[model samples]
Target: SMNPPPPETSNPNKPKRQTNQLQYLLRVVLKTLWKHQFAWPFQQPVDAVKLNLPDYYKIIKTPMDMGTIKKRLENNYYWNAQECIQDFNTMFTNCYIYNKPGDDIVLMAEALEKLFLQKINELPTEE
Candidate 1:
């Protein structure tokens, strides 16, 4: 349920043009991993604190919903590291640049990138 979405008149017609390249990648992560992939980092269920950002505890937990997914995308998770501005900084500067994310997060990101490329290949350019 979209318990608290803005009124239709309260927003713009299109998704705000994201200037941050990582935000676009983050949205893909939202689509492919955060919102769809289940029980991340292993040994945790949906109701746990780690999964608390999306807060599925409130909704009926269906496959997808536009408003709720949009709401979920609006959140930020510092603990998350699937390669974004976050992993870029942390992996390079903080502790371990040489190591990989080495988990569902990295796999999910790569998987989605490949899948989207497949999608792109299937489409003919518009003239």
Candidate 2:
């Protein structure tokens, strides 16, 4: 009798495991953001300004002069936005979907800024 054919091996080029791991991480980050309502603090003031402002406004605004909530985001709660953007860029680059010269980066940056604004809007203010 002829020997049975061996099963075909999976494609090495496919990053199924790595993709799953990244997806899991993405879910965890998203869940944490949802649980906390996307309220993570920025790790550094300079980075916060880059990650949180419109490109035009970033040049004009000083992190130190922003309102208390804005300052908190700049100095504290902006890290999560940074991490999310980093992860988004990484994933897109890895998947070969990122077109560096297009408007996607700007759009994503704006979206993250809006998320920060949403969280800041949710905070209680003094009279």
* List of clashing residue pairs for candidate 2: 40-77, 41-76, 41-77, 41-78, 42-76, 42-77, 42-78, 42-79
lDDT of 1 by residue, 1-127 (tens): 1233322312344344323433544455334434444313311222324444343335332222223233423543222222233322221221122125765445544554455444334433322
Can you tell me which runs of candidate 2 are displaced by over 4 Å? 1-102
lDDT of 2 by residue, 44-120 (tens): 12233345433423232222211222322323333234433443333234222322344654444344445544544
Model 1 residue runs over 4 Å out of place are 1-10, 13-49, 52-99
Tell how far residue 46 is off in model 2, in angstroms: 8.7
Question: Global lDDT of each model?
Answer: 0.34, 0.33
lDDT of 1 at 98: 19
For every candidate in turn, the CA RMSD to the true structure comes to: 12.3, 19.7
TM-score of each: 0.28, 0.23
User: How many clashing residue pairs are found in candidate 1?
Assistant: 0
